[PDB]
Each structure stands twice: as structure tokens, then as C-alpha cells.
Amino acid sequence: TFNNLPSIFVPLVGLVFPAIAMASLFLHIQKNK
């Protein structure tokens, strides 16, 4: 399963990691200590 690895990582970097980063950085943007 090595021709299937692009199918794993292109969503995981391009859809999932952007959701993670956008959510985390939006929380960091609006935080207040």
C-alpha cells in the first residue's frame, strides 16, 4: 500500500492539518491571559 499513501497524506495535509492549524491559530488569535 504505497500508491495509497498519497490518498492518506494529501487530505491529511491539505484538509485536516489546515483545519487543525486554522482552529488552533484562531484560538491563539482570540486568547486573553
Partner: protein
């Protein structure tokens, strides 16, 4: 330090608006302007950031190596290189339709793939690196170097290893080590690679890490070097019949100075490059041991600058006090650094096409165009940054009382003369270059091309004839056999150099004509005008008659209000911002000239360029309209081809190049008074009063919007021309 996201700045953290987000993104790497900053902490953040950049560089190179090793046809490319397409990386786009999968399947691949127009195939094949396991090993090693640079950048932020401010200001030991080791020992080690590996790899045998301690790069082995008989390293130069990658016609020499190109690859000899890197290694290792560090010998750069005051005072106080305005000022260091880097990047671009070092890189035409365009746009940007950081130095770091009457204050003493004579040279060049181009446009329009003003570039043809080009009949130092230059070098390198330059098919000192004159003067106009804008913003960075207190406003500020007639775009930042436009124009000219001259050379009809480069409808018809057919037909209604992505990127670059015009033409005030209506509507729309912003949505700031328009503009410029230059050069390939 602060509370909200710009922790480095409690002025943006205490900003209720959305400007907080943007400006905290932008000013993140401006450590000099952060809160609670010291020179020590500034230097340490710079050092750790340099480590991070080196880590990202090695990671990006490891990614190239991995995606050529995993998804590349590199093992097939090293068999028949000049008739097998490189493969950058695979593609898994779930939006692709089946025709686009049928179309993007290239290079004999199991699926759709992207063609490496970057030249990493040719370069890696030239330095050894035959099988894909070698590229895998290289990617592993560069991942290791990325982790090493990250480790170093974290380690040199801890207190036990945080270096001191006076350690980054050791401007003699650093030059000593970087010349001797970073420049000299590294060139020496690259000679070691070229001798132990790349020359044996070009001549058959694969000397790898397991069997490099028991093979001889030269059959004698260190007898010639230690005994001084260095000519023994130039005995069998694998003359005129060597097949790259096989032992047929190979040789034993490792440092022979031959000059000119390989006959097969039309690249330079690996023996030539080995001897080259060896020679500059000796020169840099010698030049390293110059600056005094710890040992009681060497120069102090202070007492070289302090001592270079001419009697008579034509300069003034000379360089008296200039060690302190560079050692204590990181923006002077950065400006000089980017100046040198832009000069040598342009040099890289100008020499890699005419003296290609890699095997079969002159034979793939899209690669050379992509590389020249890349390094020249990079060089123009790096040059613009050199000047921008000189302006930032003049504002932030320049101390006039410390450098009174020296060679640097004398810039500001007569800055009007510099700016006005640059404004003369650029104005002359534009008036006359455009006048001649328009004269020729009208002559071709009126059907009388014989009336054109075709000024031959005699002064460049004379230099070409001073290098052995026997295409003009000037009979100069190297075109004349009876000369001192064609006698002291006729036994060493002039045979190969003459037989390379006289070949009309390669890029070495192309046969030029009047179109080349005219476009060289357009190039001079671009360089002089970008220089004018940048120098004017650097010297008027501290102040002018319209705003003498500009230094108090910083580098980037919007304006000084409508008063005093109007002060739009008065900052030195704004000068930079306009100079990026003129820079992109200049590099567009140099690269249009390059790409059309070369695509006409590669096609065969140099006469096309020579008769069509003298009038601008020849550039619009025979270059932009003609070569963009196969591009814009990348996707037609009845099908698509492999250039569909370049057509889409072409139109994308058009779209963002046009979107930058929104931010450049349309300015603020209209948008704040629009977003006020939008905020009203959101606060009075039912089921959306529930949702309310936390950051008050203001329009973009002024200087920010100039930046954003410039970013859209440059992204579109670059993407459009990349798409056109790759699609046209890959739709036909010469």
C-alpha cells in the same frame, strides 16, 4: 510581554480591530521593533531564526530528493537522459477528471506526474547519485541536517549556550572562518566529491561510501600532490568522445583545465569543475587567514577602514568610523549581504545558461528557462531587499554624529546629485530606447522596415570578439591568433573555449544584433530606474524638504497627511514598494529577452528574433501571441492536454495580478465606509445578531494594502510568466 496574539507587541495586542491579526503576522520577524527587546536578545533570535531557515532548506531539499526517489523516473532518466522526461513528483488531486489523469501521465509512470523543470535530475546525475537509493540516502541525510539545525537553534536559545552580543559582533573571526572554512573548506570538500565520486561516476564506476576508501581517484594517488607534480592530474582529459556515465572514451585526469564544453552533454567538464573548486578553495583558505582573531597576526577591519582616508579629502573623512556603523547595525550587514547575493544570483543565472555545469541541462530547454527566470527574479527581489534594508539602516541604525563627514554621510550630503543623475540616466534611456522602439514600430507599421534605427551593439560584439567569437571580423585579443592572449592560453583552455564559443548552437556568447542593443538599453533603463527609486528612498529615508522628520516616523508609515500639498507614498517603504513594480518590469524585460532569444535559437530561426526584436509588435506578435498558443490551448472545449495546468496557472496569475490593482488603485476610506455598512447589516440581520465578531472588522491599513496589492501583483506576475515560459518551452521543446 503582552496579552493577545501579538505577544511580541503590546500595541497590536491592545488593538480591538482586525488590524491586530494582520500586523502581528507581518511584524513577527521584525525583532528590532518588539517590546522589551535588547541587542542581545535580537541577535539571539536572529541566530535561532537562521537555524530555522537552514532546517527548512535542508527539509525542502530532502523533500525534493524523496519525491524524485519515490515518485520519480530518475533510474530511467540516467539511461537515456536527453530523451526521457524528468518527474518532479506524483500528483493525487481528487478533483482530477479521467482525461486529466490520462494527460498528466508522463515519463513512463504508473500514474499522473509532474515534469521536473527544476534541473535537480541533471544536477544530481552530474554529481553522482545514480540509483534512487542514493537519493533516498540523501533525503535521509538532509532530514538529519534539518533536525541538526533545529537542535542548534533550540540549543542556542537556552541560557547555557545563548551567545553574547559581543560574539555576533566578532566581525574578524567570522570572516576568517567563513572565508577559510565555509567558503574554502567547502569548495575543497566539493572538489573531494567531484574527484572521488562525480568523475568516477561520469567515467563508469560507482564510488560510494562502502568502497571509497579502497579506490584511487587517480591511479598514482597523492604522489603528484605531495611531490608537486600536479600536471599528472591532467594527463588523460577524456578527449572529445567520452560518453557520460560509461567508461567509453573516459580518462584518468581529475583537475585538467580544458575550457569549453563536453561534446556529448554540452556541459562543463567535471575535471574542470573539480580543478575550479580546488583553486577557489586555495584562494578562500588563503583569504581567510587575513583578519586578526586571537593569535597576534592579521588585520583589524577597523584600522583598515580608519586608515583608508585619502589625503586631500576628496572623499572627506573616508571610512573613519564605518566599522561601527556595520558591526553594530544588522541592517547595513543585511543590505550589503543581499547586494552581494543579488549580484551573484544574477551571475548564477547568467553563467548557468551560457556555461551549464550539469549533464544534459542545455538539452532540456524548459529547465534552462525556468532556472534563469527563477534566479533572475530572485536576484531582482534580493537586490530590492538589499536597498530596502539600506533604507531601514539609514532610518533605524544610522548615527550621523558617530560618522560625521565620512564616506557614508557624504551620501546624504549630495543625495540630490545621485538621485538627479540617476533620474537623468533612466530618463535618457527610457526616452531614447522607447523612441527607437516606437520608430521601428512605426516603420514596420508603414511597411518600411529599412527605415528602422538598428544600432548594432559594436561594443558587445567587440567583447565577444575579444573572447574568440569569429562572427564579426574584429580580430581582437582572442579572435586574433597573433596576440599575447592567444599565445599564453592557446595551450591550456583556449582550444576548448574557442570550439565552444564558435558553436552557434549553444548559449555561450550568443550572436547578438540591434534588437539585443535595444533590449539591453531597456534593461539598463530598468536597472537605473529601480536603482533610482530605491536609492532615492534610501537617501530620503531620514528626511527630505517635504518631510525632514521622516526618521521619527520609522521605515513603514502610510503618509504625512494631505497637508503640504499631499504626502502619499512618501515613506522609504513606499519607494521600495514602487521599486518592486519597476523591478518586476526589469526582470520581465530581461527574461522576455532571454526566453525569446533562446526559443528562437532552439527552434532554429535566430533570424526571427534578429528581424523581430527591434519593434515591439514583434515582441507582442512573434513572442507573446505566437508562443502562447499551445499554452492557452491547454484546455479547449474539445479536450485538454498536459499544459492544462499551465493554462490554469496563467489565468490564475492574471487574476491575482489584476486583484493587486484593487488594493493599489482603490485605496482605503472607500472600504472602511463599506465595512461600516456591512457591520450595520450584520448587527441588524436576524439570526446573525447571535454571531458577533471579537475583532472589529476594519478595512486594511494603507501601507498594508500597498503590500497586499504588491503581493497579489508579484504573485500574478511570477505565476503568469512561469506558466507561459514553461508551457511554451514544454509544448514544443525547441
Amino acid at each position: 510581554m503582552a496579552l493577545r496574539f501579538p505577544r511580541f507587541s503590546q500595541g497590536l495586542a491592545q488593538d480591538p480591530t482586525t488590524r491586530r491579526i494582520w500586523f502581528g503576522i507581518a511584524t513577527a520577524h521584525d525583532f528590532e521593533s518588539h517590546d522589551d527587546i535588547t541587542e542581545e536578545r535580537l541577535y539571539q533570535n536572529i541566530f535561532a531564526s537562521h537555524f530555522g531557515q537552514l532546517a527548512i532548506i535542508f527539509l525542502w531539499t530532502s523533500g525534493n530528493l524523496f519525491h524524485v526517489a519515490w515518485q520519480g523516473n530518475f533510474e530511467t532518466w540516467v539511461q537515456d537522459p536527453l530523451h526521457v522526461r524528468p518527474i518532479a513528483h506524483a500528483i493525487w488531486d481528487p478533483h482530477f477528471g479521467q482525461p486529466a489523469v490520462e494527460a498528466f501521465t508522463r515519463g513512463g509512470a504508473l500514474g499522473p506526474v509532474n515534469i521536473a523543470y527544476s534541473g535537480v535530475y541533471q544536477w544530481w546525475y552530474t554529481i553522482g547519485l545514480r540509483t534512487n537509493e542514493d537519493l533516498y540516502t540523501g533525503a535521509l541525510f538532509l532530514l538529519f541536517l534539518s533536525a541538526l539545525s533545529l537542535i542548534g537553534g533550540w540549543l542556542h536559545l537556552q541560557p547555557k549556550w545563548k551567545p553574547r552580543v559581543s560574539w555576533f559582533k566578532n566581525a574578524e573571526s567570522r570572516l576568517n572562518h567563513h572565508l577559510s572554512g565555509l567558503f574554502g573548506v567547502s569548495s575543497l570538500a566539493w572538489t573531494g566529491h567531484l574527484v572521488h565520486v562525480a568523475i568516477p561516476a561520469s567515467r563508469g564506476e560507482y564510488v560510494r561510501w562502502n568502497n571509497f576508501l579502497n579506490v584511487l581517484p587517480h591511479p598514482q594517488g597523492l604522489g603528484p600532490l605531495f611531490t608537486g607534480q600536479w600536471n599528472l592530474y591532467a594527463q588523460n582529459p577524456d578527449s572529445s568522445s567520452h560518453l557520460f556515465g560509461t567508461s567509453q572514451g573516459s580518462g584518468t585526469a581529475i583537475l585538467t583545465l580544458l575550457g569549453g564544453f563536453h561534446p556529448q552533454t554540452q556541459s562543463l567538464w567535471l575535471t574542470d569543475m573539480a580543478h575550479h573548486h580546488l583553486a577557489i578553495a586555495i584562494l578562500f583558505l588563503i583569504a581567510g587567514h587575513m583578519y586578526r582573531t586571537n593569535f597576534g597576526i592579521g588585520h583589524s577591519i577597523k584600522d583598515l577602514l580608519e586608515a583608508h582616508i585619502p589625503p586631500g579629502g576628496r572623499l572627506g573623512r573616508g571610512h573613519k568610523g564605518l566599522y561601527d556603523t556595520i558591526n553594530n547595525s544588522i541592517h547595513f550587514q543585511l543590505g550589503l549581504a543581499l547586494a552581494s547575493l543579488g549580484v551573484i544570483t544574477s551571475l548564477v543565472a547568467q553563467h548557468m545558461y551560457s556555461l551549464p555545469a550539469y549533464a544534459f541541462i542545455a538539452q532540456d530547454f524548459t529547465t534552462q528557462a525556468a532556472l534563469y527566470t527563477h534566479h533572475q527574479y530572485i536576484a531582482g527581489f534580493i537586490m530590492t531587499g538589499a536597498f530596502a534594508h539600506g533604507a531601514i539602516f539609514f532610518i533605524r541604525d544610522y548615527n550621523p554624529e558617530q560618522n560625521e563627514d565620512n564616506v557614508l554621510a557624504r551620501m546624504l550630503d549630495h543625495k540630490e546629485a545621485i538621485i538627479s543623475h540617476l533620474s537623468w540616466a533612466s530618463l535618457f534611456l527610457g526616452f531614447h530606447t522607447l523612441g527607437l522602439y516606437v520608430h521601428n514600430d512605426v516603420m514596420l507599421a508603414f511597411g518600411t522596415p529599412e527605415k528602422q534605427i538598428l544600432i548594432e551593439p559594436i561594443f558587445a560584439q567587440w567583447i565577444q570578439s575579444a573572447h574568440g567569437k569569429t562572427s564579426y571580423g574584429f580580430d581582437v585579443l582572442l579572435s586574433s591568433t597573433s596576440g599575447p592572449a592567444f599565445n599564453a592560453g592557446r595551450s591550456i583552455w583556449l582550444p576548448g573555449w574557442l570550439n565552444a564559443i564558435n558553436e552557434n548552437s549553444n548559449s555561450l556568447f550568443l550572436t547578438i544584433g540591434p534588437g539585443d542593443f535595444l533590449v539591453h538599453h531597456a534593461i539598463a533603463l530598468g536597472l537605473h530606474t529601480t536603482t533610482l527609486i530605491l536609492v532615492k528612498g534610501a537617501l530620503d529615508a531620514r528626511g527630505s524638504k517635504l518631510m525632514p522628520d521622516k526618521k521619527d516616523f520609522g521605515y513603514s508609515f502610510p503618509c504625512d497627511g494631505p497637508g503640504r500639498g499631499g504626502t502619499c507614498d512618501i515613506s522609504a517603504w513606499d519607494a521600495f514598494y514602487l521599486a518592486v513594480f519597476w523591478m518586476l518590469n526589469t526582470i520581465g524585460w530581461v527574461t522576455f529577452y532571454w526566453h525569446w532569444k533562446h526559443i528562437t535559437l532552439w527552434q532554429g530561426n535566430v533570424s526571427q528574433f534578429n528581424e523581430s526584436s527591434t519593434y515591439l509588435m514583434g515582441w507582442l506578435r512573434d513572442y507573446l501571441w505566437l508562443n502562447s498558443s499551445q499554452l492557452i490551448n491547454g484546455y479547449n472545449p474539445f479536450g485538454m492536454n498536459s499544459l492544462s495546468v499551465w493554462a490554469w496557472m496563467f489565468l490564475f496569475g492574471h487574476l491575482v495580478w489584476a486583484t493587486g490593482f484593487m488594493f493599489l488603485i482603490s485605496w482605503r476610506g472607500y472600504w472602511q465606509e463599506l465595512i461600516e455598512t456591512l457591520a450595520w447589516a450584520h448587527e441588524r440581520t436576524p439570526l446573525a445578531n447571535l454571531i458577533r465578531w471579537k475583532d472589529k472588522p476594519v478595512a486594511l491599513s494603507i501601507v498594508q494594502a500597498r503590500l497586499v496589492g504588491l503581493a497579489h501583483f508579484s504573485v500574478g506576475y511570477i505565476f503568469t510568466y512561469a506558466a507561459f515560459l514553461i508551457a511554451s518551452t514544454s509544448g514544443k521543446f525547441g
